[PDB]
Design an enzyme around this catalytic site. Structure first.
Site, short mmCIF file in Angstrom:
data_model
loop_
_atom_site.label_atom_id
_atom_site.label_comp_id
_atom_site.label_asym_id
_atom_site.label_seq_id
_atom_site.Cartn_x
_atom_site.Cartn_y
_atom_site.Cartn_z
N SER A 134 0.35 5.78 28.00
CA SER A 134 0.70 7.30 28.10
C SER A 134 1.93 7.18 27.32
O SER A 134 2.16 7.99 26.38
CB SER A 134 0.53 8.17 29.18
N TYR A 137 2.63 7.59 23.54
CA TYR A 137 2.28 8.70 22.87
C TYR A 137 3.64 9.65 22.68
O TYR A 137 3.61 10.63 22.27
CB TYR A 137 1.20 9.43 23.63
N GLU A 218 -9.16 5.27 30.28
CA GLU A 218 -8.57 6.43 29.74
C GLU A 218 -9.62 7.65 30.63
O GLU A 218 -10.72 7.21 30.63
CB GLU A 218 -8.39 6.79 28.32
N1 LIG Z 1 -1.66 11.35 25.42
C1 LIG Z 1 -1.79 10.37 26.47
O1 LIG Z 1 -1.16 10.19 27.51
C2 LIG Z 1 -3.31 9.78 26.21
C3 LIG Z 1 -3.68 8.66 27.23
C4 LIG Z 1 -4.75 8.09 26.95
C5 LIG Z 1 -5.47 8.15 26.16
C6 LIG Z 1 -5.01 8.96 25.07
C7 LIG Z 1 -5.67 9.17 23.59
O2 LIG Z 1 -6.70 8.53 23.15
C8 LIG Z 1 -4.96 10.16 23.01
C9 LIG Z 1 -5.09 11.00 22.07
C10 LIG Z 1 -4.16 11.62 21.11
C11 LIG Z 1 -4.81 12.01 19.86
C12 LIG Z 1 -4.12 12.84 18.82
C13 LIG Z 1 -2.56 13.32 19.31
C14 LIG Z 1 -2.09 13.99 18.22
O3 LIG Z 1 -1.81 13.71 17.13
N2 LIG Z 1 -1.54 15.13 18.74
C15 LIG Z 1 -0.91 16.30 17.83
C16 LIG Z 1 0.33 16.70 18.26
N3 LIG Z 1 0.24 17.34 19.55
C17 LIG Z 1 0.70 18.78 19.80
N4 LIG Z 1 1.11 19.30 18.74
C18 LIG Z 1 1.30 20.76 19.02
C19 LIG Z 1 1.05 21.17 20.11
C20 LIG Z 1 0.73 20.45 21.26
N5 LIG Z 1 0.53 19.03 21.25
C21 LIG Z 1 -0.36 16.38 20.52
C22 LIG Z 1 -1.76 15.84 20.17
C23 LIG Z 1 -2.31 12.77 20.32
C24 LIG Z 1 -3.00 12.18 21.29
O4 LIG Z 1 -3.79 10.60 23.95
C25 LIG Z 1 -3.86 9.75 24.91
#
Ligand SMILES: NC(=O)c1cccc2c(O)c(Cc3ccc(C(=O)N4CCN(c5ncccn5)CC4)cc3)oc12
Length: 240
Positions: A134, A137, A218
């Site tokens: 996480s 990210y 996940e």
């Molecule tokens: N975020 C985590 O802690 C997490 C944990 C486990 C697996 C994944 C997994 O596959 C992802 C996917 C993921 C895919 C795409 C994005 C992604 O690009 N995002 C765009 C920006 N964003 C956002 N923008 C405006 C308002 C709110 N949010 C967030 C989303 C981000 C994350 O995220 C994961």
């Protein structure tokens, strides 16, 4: 001048990049500092310590502050899932610039216009049981090494356990969530319960799952009401 505790003031300054207390109220979230000395803080620090993946070796993590959070209306929204089995405390990382929206609106599913790139089980709300998966990210850097990460109580219920990407059209009957099965898992013998929520803070071990696309687990829910955001951590990333 603000009447908030200094760590909360510093959090607001980080999130908003109006007076502090006006920006606080825009989050529509009660924020409390968790005492360093407390059982909760001990558990959370252990979760961070034990679940940093071996392959995420570009940085180590230090917990600066732990906040307990309660979004306005969360109690009533989560109520229909509050009694579902298999409720787990899981990580969610995001860029700092997203947190004003995340706290005010909660975690949301990406809209149709967003790419499905990065979502191996289709658009939903994604979580990890390994802090570093996480924390990646947060997109921190040496020049910008402080990040924010959430711990959510996620009502997983009966998990649809998958090993390869599949953008499922609908959950099978009786299933409440998807779990992607990794090669490495927190040792399930070390799970503890915090306030009736399972915390998988065991050190990583081989899961014994073969024929899988995932290094680490996940967890995905497809209904925003299955998430109860509980803690927000301010983390220092020490880059190597
Ligand atoms: N975020 C985590 O802690 C997490 C944990 C486990 C697996 C994944 C997994 O596959 C992802 C996917 C993921 C895919 C795409 C994005 C992604 O690009 N995002 C765009 C920006 N964003 C956002 N923008 C405006 C308002 C709110 N949010 C967030 C989303 C981000 C994350 O995220 C994961």
């Amino acid at each position: 001048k603000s009447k908030l505790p200094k760590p909360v003031q510093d959090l607001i300054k980080m999130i908003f990049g109006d007076p502090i207390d006006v920006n606080y109220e825009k989050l529509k979230t009660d924020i409390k500092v968790v005492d360093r000395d407390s059982e909760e803080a001990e558990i959370i620090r252990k979760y961070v310590k034990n679940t940093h993946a071996t392959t995420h070796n570009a940085y180590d993590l230090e917990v600066i502050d732990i906040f307990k959070i309660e979004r306005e209306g969360e109690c009533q929204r989560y109520k229909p899932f509050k009694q579902l089995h298999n409720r787990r405390l899981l990580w969610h990382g995001s860029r700092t610039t997203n947190f004003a929206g995340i706290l005010s609106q909660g975690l949301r599913i990406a809209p149709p216009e967003a790419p499905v790139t990065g979502y191996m089980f289709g658009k939903g709300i994604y979580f990890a049981d390994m802090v570093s998966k996480s924390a990646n990210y947060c997109h921190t850097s040496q020049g910008d090494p402080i990040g924010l990460i959430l711990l959510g109580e996620v009502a997983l219920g009966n998990m649809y356990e998958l090993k390869h990407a599949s953008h499922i059209s609908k959950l099978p009957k009786g299933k409440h969530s998807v779990k992607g099965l990794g090669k490495t898992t927190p040792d399930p013998s070390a799970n503890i319960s915090l306030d009736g929520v399972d915390v998988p803070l065991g050190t990583g071990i081989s899961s014994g799952v073969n024929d899988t696309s995932l290094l680490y687990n996940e967890y995905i829910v497809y209904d925003i009401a299955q998430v109860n955001l509980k803690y927000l951590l301010k983390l220092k990333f020490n880059f190597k």
